[PDB]
Design an enzyme around this catalytic site. Structure first.
Site, PDB file in Angstrom:
ATOM      1  N   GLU A 118      16.540   3.925 100.721  1.00 23.57           N
ATOM      2  CA  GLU A 118      15.300   4.744 100.609  1.00 23.57           C
ATOM      3  C   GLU A 118      14.311   4.270 101.669  1.00 23.57           C
ATOM      4  O   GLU A 118      14.169   3.064 101.908  1.00 23.57           O
ATOM      5  CB  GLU A 118      14.650   4.682  99.234  1.00 23.57           C
ATOM      6  N   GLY A 258       9.817  -4.586  96.436  1.00 25.32           N
ATOM      7  CA  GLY A 258      10.090  -5.346  95.258  1.00 25.32           C
ATOM      8  C   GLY A 258      11.517  -5.143  94.738  1.00 25.32           C
ATOM      9  O   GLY A 258      12.207  -6.099  94.288  1.00 25.32           O
ATOM     10  N   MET A 260      14.873  -1.808  94.175  1.00 23.33           N
ATOM     11  CA  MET A 260      15.304  -0.437  94.461  1.00 23.33           C
ATOM     12  C   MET A 260      16.218   0.086  93.376  1.00 23.33           C
ATOM     13  O   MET A 260      17.181  -0.614  92.955  1.00 23.33           O
ATOM     14  CB  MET A 260      16.012  -0.431  95.807  1.00 23.33           C
ATOM     15  N   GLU A 261      15.957   1.297  92.934  1.00 25.71           N
ATOM     16  CA  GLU A 261      16.676   1.879  91.774  1.00 25.71           C
ATOM     17  C   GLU A 261      18.074   2.507  91.999  1.00 25.71           C
ATOM     18  O   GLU A 261      18.464   3.502  91.352  1.00 25.71           O
ATOM     19  CB  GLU A 261      15.796   2.944  91.142  1.00 25.71           C
ATOM     20  N   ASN A 262      18.871   1.928  92.862  1.00 20.14           N
ATOM     21  CA  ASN A 262      20.133   2.586  93.210  1.00 20.14           C
ATOM     22  C   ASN A 262      20.974   2.751  92.006  1.00 20.14           C
ATOM     23  O   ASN A 262      21.089   1.833  91.217  1.00 20.14           O
ATOM     24  CB  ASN A 262      20.925   1.803  94.276  1.00 20.14           C
ATOM     25  N   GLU A 295      12.541  -0.158  87.630  1.00 22.83           N
ATOM     26  CA  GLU A 295      13.759   0.282  88.251  1.00 22.83           C
ATOM     27  C   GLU A 295      14.681   0.905  87.184  1.00 22.83           C
ATOM     28  O   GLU A 295      15.339   1.918  87.423  1.00 22.83           O
ATOM     29  CB  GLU A 295      14.438  -0.871  88.912  1.00 22.83           C
ATOM     30  N   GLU A 317       7.493   8.319  91.570  1.00 20.31           N
ATOM     31  CA  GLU A 317       6.788   7.013  91.561  1.00 20.31           C
ATOM     32  C   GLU A 317       5.581   6.933  90.636  1.00 20.31           C
ATOM     33  O   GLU A 317       5.357   5.906  89.941  1.00 20.31           O
ATOM     34  CB  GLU A 317       6.439   6.600  92.929  1.00 20.31           C
TER      35      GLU A 317
HETATM   36  N1  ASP Z   1       8.734  -0.615  94.887  1.00 21.35           N
HETATM   37  C1  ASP Z   1       9.641  -0.071  95.968  1.00 21.35           C
HETATM   38  C2  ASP Z   1      10.695   0.912  95.437  1.00 21.35           C
HETATM   39  C3  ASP Z   1      10.341   1.479  94.048  1.00 21.35           C
HETATM   40  O1  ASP Z   1       9.482   2.356  93.886  1.00 21.35           O
HETATM   41  O2  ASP Z   1      10.962   1.072  93.086  1.00 21.35           O
HETATM   42  C4  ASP Z   1       8.908   0.614  97.084  1.00 21.35           C
HETATM   43  O3  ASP Z   1       7.695   0.383  97.404  1.00 21.35           O
HETATM   44  O4  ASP Z   1       9.659   1.412  97.646  1.00 21.35           O
HETATM   45 NA    NA Z   2      15.115   7.766  92.353  1.00 18.41          NA
HETATM   46 NA    NA Z   3      11.104   1.454 102.681  1.00 22.00          NA
HETATM   47 NA    NA Z   4      11.877   3.607  94.866  1.00 19.28          NA
HETATM   48 ZN    ZN Z   5       9.580   3.220  91.946  1.00 18.37          ZN
END
Ligand code: ASP
Ligand code: NA
Ligand code: NA
Ligand code: NA
Ligand code: ZN
Ligand code: NA
Ligand code: NA
Ligand code: NA
Ligand code: NA
Length: 867
Positions: A118, A258, A260-262, A295, A317
């Site tokens: 992402e 922080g 990532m939600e893969n 996540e 988000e």
């Molecule tokens: N916190 C991460 C990803 C997320 O939203 O989980 C970011 O700023 O992309």
């Molecule tokens: Na997503």
């Molecule tokens: Na990024």
């Molecule tokens: Na994200």
């Molecule tokens: Zn997020």
């Protein structure tokens, strides 16, 4: 230099890819990727297929196994012409994980290989429709050296595996849910694994697996626990179960964000996984909880329903942040959560919404999408979701969630779709409310009141406006949910009513100016206004000090007590910053100190709340009070206020500090609240008589049985420049230098030191054995903390701060543009400062603008700033 993209330009893709079968022949220096995609044309017959790709070495292109001649590579793309309507595309290409310092795509984290796709990282792995409205069923085969990479992970389940000659092996994974490619993940490496199980409420057993570097297994159980707590809460609160058989999490050390939600295979910055009671603070524990939850919550709000396009980022988000906050709040202290989230809104996001980078939560224009993972999209986004919740109530809100998933599960949706679902399920009109999605800046709400003893009516006259922002010159009234409560002089709520009938306490402030009249107000009320920060606005109301202390003593919601305290202080912060600029020392009425004394000694106040009232607004929150920021005056005033309170409250401070002593350390909410109060007292006590203070702080540091208490003491030594500081700092280095996460806290303390020689110490630390420019956590903890959390030093009058940041960004621009762009944020705020500061900050930005190979990430911000 690349071009802005515009939301209004969205168009449905000419081609879709339904299924993709990937193979990686993995090696750090050279990975060979083979990608077999099934494609279907949806647009005009003569439309070429345009695939995105960056830094790829193209080896071959076939279409139904025929080598294709009708294609060309152009900048960022591979354009393939003259195609049938349905076909198999096969691409072979090479990439090089070891050269990837930007940490997007496939890259190396210590000895592991992992991915970050992402927003637009997948195109760094192969040529693809790297846009989130293209959803494909992935199957992923990974081939690699068995000794270096015994674990080979991707999304979904293992469906095949084998051994090969020359000590190689492979695993093939399959994920049945169609997904946009930003949710692809691959990890290869050698890890300790903590395994556990969660059983969903309908009886499905999920295998949980947390992969950490060898030797870190002792720091995994809290994260595993929080994951289970997350799965359980999402069931109870939202009715959502996990939808696969396995849930993997991998903690890696080199990671820009922080986590990532893969899907089925989250990858986390180790900061948000690893904890033991001697390494991590209460705050770390509750951050790990938050981010594991976040996540996990994305599995539905993000993965099962994804985003049509990146301008819809807040669809996932804002909503997912709202969910993580409701999770933290339900499990812990709701008041503390709300308070902290409000402090973040007022102190950090408001500043962005007044910056050159301002944007609406659903942006209209973007050049580098990595620049839009922001306080606004996330935090203000959540405040917007929370306004919907305020307006509908929980039962209706949950109906909207259900309608949202029923309509959109398995598709890529828009913010507008989410609003429509909430409106249709609830029958609450949110037409005007939608403007929160399209308008930037922080509304200002002005309230005037009148009590009329003849008529027994209280009247509020409420106004709003949002100033122009650099991005939008026209602004219009929003639909502001404006919660109130009215108190009689004993502290009882006065029923809100008008012409015989109950009135809702959430007033609908929809116009520029309106009046609200309450009847049957038999006695002049004191109001609480904007309760629970019911909209993300500035409130202009001419509080008396007495109304505010009354609220500190009687308001029914904890938050309102906190907020009244913040309004009380605000007047005196502003007073004393003007004084400081004229060389005048701090002046605080006796009755103000007495209001905090009363809070220290009220045994009926929840300590969680007392602690927050006795935590003074940060220099960032103080800055939002001013049109022009003076950071040196703010910092000196915050220090002076703290010393004044310390002196006037010394005995009470010591007493509450001692009363909240806890010999057992537990990570439990009541214990955390007491410790937080204890340590809030400690901060003042550190600024008392020098010898008492030095002894007390040094003792806490040395006798702590947990990192929360040790860090609080060390931090106090630093803040108050106590004689023990250098020795405690060196002791922590000697003990903890080999541990990056723990040294990060020490780097922060160095960078935010009030010492006169802080910058010089900070430069020196660029050579410290625990620092490296290769690691974003170290960067953010030392450099980013200096620039962003020590405004007083960053903005030193000799301009040395700006020059230091320029040197650091000159390196990071090439190494890791995303971390560079995080770190540039303080310089782009130049117009909030005085002319002499603006001038040096512009010069620093003009230097950056002239860099050879200026990244898009920085170009975007720098040109808005210099405008
Ligand atoms: N916190 C991460 C990803 C997320 O939203 O989980 C970011 O700023 O992309
Ligand atoms: Na997503
Ligand atoms: Na990024
Ligand atoms: Na994200
Ligand atoms: Zn997020
Ligand atoms: Na598709
Ligand atoms: Na709670
Ligand atoms: Na209360
Ligand atoms: Na601010």
């Amino acid at each position: 230099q690349p071009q802005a993209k515009y939301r209004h330009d969205y168009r449905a893709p000419d081609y879709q890819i339904t299924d993709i079968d990937l193979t990686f022949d993995l090696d750090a220096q050279k990975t060979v990727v083979t990608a077999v995609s099934q494609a279907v044309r949806h647009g005009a017959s003569d439309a070429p297929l345009r695939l995105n790709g960056e830094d790829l070495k193209l080896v071959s292109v076939h279409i139904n196994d025929e080598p294709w001649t009708a294609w060309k590579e152009e900048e960022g793309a591979l354009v393939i012409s003259n195609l049938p309507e349905r076909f198999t595309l096969k691409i072979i290409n090479e990439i090089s994980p070891a050269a990837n310092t930007a940490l997007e795509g496939l890259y190396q984290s210590g000895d592991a290989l992992c991915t970050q796709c992402e927003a637009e990282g997948f195109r760094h792995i192969t040529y693809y429709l790297d846009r989130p409205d293209v959803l494909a069923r992935f199957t992923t085969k990974i081939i690699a050296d068995k000794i270096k990479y015994p674990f080979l992970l991707s999304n979904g389940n293992r469906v095949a595996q084998g051994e090969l000659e020359n000590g190689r092996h492979w695993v093939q994974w399959q994920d049945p849910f169609p997904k946009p490619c930003y949710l692809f993940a691959l990890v290869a490496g050698d890890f300790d694994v903590l395994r556990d199980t969660f059983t969903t409420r309908s009886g499905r057993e999920v295998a949980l697996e947390l992969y950490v570097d060898r030797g870190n297994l002792d720091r995994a159980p809290w994260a595993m626990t929080s994951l289970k707590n997350s799965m359980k809460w999402d069931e109870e609160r939202f009715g959502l179960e996990y939808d696969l058989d396995i849930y993997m999490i991998v903690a890696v050390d080199f990671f820009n964000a922080g986590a990532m939600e893969n899907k089925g295979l989250n990858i986390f910055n180790s900061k948000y996984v690893l904890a033991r009671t001697d390494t991590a603070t209460d705050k770390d524990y509750l951050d790990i909880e938050r981010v594991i939850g976040h996540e996990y919550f994305h599995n539905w709000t993000g993965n099962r329903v994804t985003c049509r396009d990146w301008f819809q980022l807040s669809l996932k988000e804002g909503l997912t942040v709202f969910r993580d906050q409701e999770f933290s709040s339900d499990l812990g202290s709701r008041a503390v959560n709300r308070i902290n989230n409000v402090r973040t809104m007022r102190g950090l996001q408001f500043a962005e919404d007044a910056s050159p980078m301002a944007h609406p939560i659903r942006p209209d224009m973007v050049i580098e999408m990595n620049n839009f993972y922001t306080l606004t999209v996330y935090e203000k986004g959540a405040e917007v979701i929370r306004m919907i919740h305020t307006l509908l109530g929980e039962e209706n809100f949950q109906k909207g969630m259900q309608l949202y998933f029923e309509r959109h599960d398995g598709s890529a949706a828009t913010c507008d779709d989410f609003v429509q679902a909430m409106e249709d399920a609830s029958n609450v009109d949110l037409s005007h409310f939608r403007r929160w999605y399209s308008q930037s800046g922080t509304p200002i709400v002005t309230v005037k009141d009148d009590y009329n003893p003849e008529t027994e009516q209280y009247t509020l006259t409420i106004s709003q406006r949002t100033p122009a922002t650099p991005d939008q010159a026209e602004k219009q009234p929003l639909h502001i949910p404006f919660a109130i409560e009215l108190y009689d002089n004993e502290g009882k709520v006065i029923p809100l009513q008008k012409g015989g009938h109950p009135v809702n306490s959430v007033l609908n402030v929809t116009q520029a100016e309106q009046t609200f009249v309450f009847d049957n107000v038999y006695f002049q009320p004191v109001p609480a206004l904007l309760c629970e920060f019911s909209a993300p606005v500035k409130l202009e109301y001419k509080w008396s000090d007495q109304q505010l202390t009354f609220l500190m003593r009687h308001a029914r919601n904890d938050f309102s007590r906190w907020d009244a305290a913040q309004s009380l202080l605000a007047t005196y912060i502003k007073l004393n910053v003007a004084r400081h600029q004229q060389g005048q020392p701090l002046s605080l009425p006796v009755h103000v100190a007495d209001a905090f004394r009363a809070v220290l000694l009220d045994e009926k106040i929840d300590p969680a709340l007392a602690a927050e009232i006795l935590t003074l607004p940060s220099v960032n929150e103080m800055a939002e009070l001013f049109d022009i920021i003076d950071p040196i005056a703010i910092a000196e005033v915050r220090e002076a206020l703290t010393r004044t309170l310390a002196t006037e409250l010394a005995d009470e401070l010591l007493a509450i500090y001692n009363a909240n002593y806890q010999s057992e350390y537990r990570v439990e909410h009541e214990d955390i609240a007491k410790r937080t109060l204890r340590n809030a007292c400690l901060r003042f006590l550190a600024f008392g008589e020098t010898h008492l203070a030095d002894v007390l702080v040094s003792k806490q540091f040395h006798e702590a049985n947990n990192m929360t208490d040790a860090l609080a003491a060390l931090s106090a030594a630093v803040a108050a420049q106590l004689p023990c500081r250098d020795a405690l700092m060196q002791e922590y280095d000697d003990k903890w230098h080999q541990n990056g996460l723990v040294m990060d806290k020490w780097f922060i303390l160095q960078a935010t030191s009030p010492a006169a020689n802080v910058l010089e110490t900070v430069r020196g630390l660029l050579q410290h054995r625990s620092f490296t420019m290769s690691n974003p956590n170290r960067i953010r903890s030392l450099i980013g903390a200096f620039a962003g959390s020590n405004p007083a030093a960053f903005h030193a009058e000799d301009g040395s701060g700006y020059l230091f940041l320029v040197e650091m960004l000159t390196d990071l621009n090439s190494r890791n543009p995303q971390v560079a762009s995080r770190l540039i944020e303080p310089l782009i705020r130049l117009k909030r400062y005085d002319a002499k500061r603006q001038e040096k900050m512009r010069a620093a930005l003009e230097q950056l603008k002239g860099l050879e190979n200026l990244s898009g990430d920085l170009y975007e911000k720098i040109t808005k700033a210099l405008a």
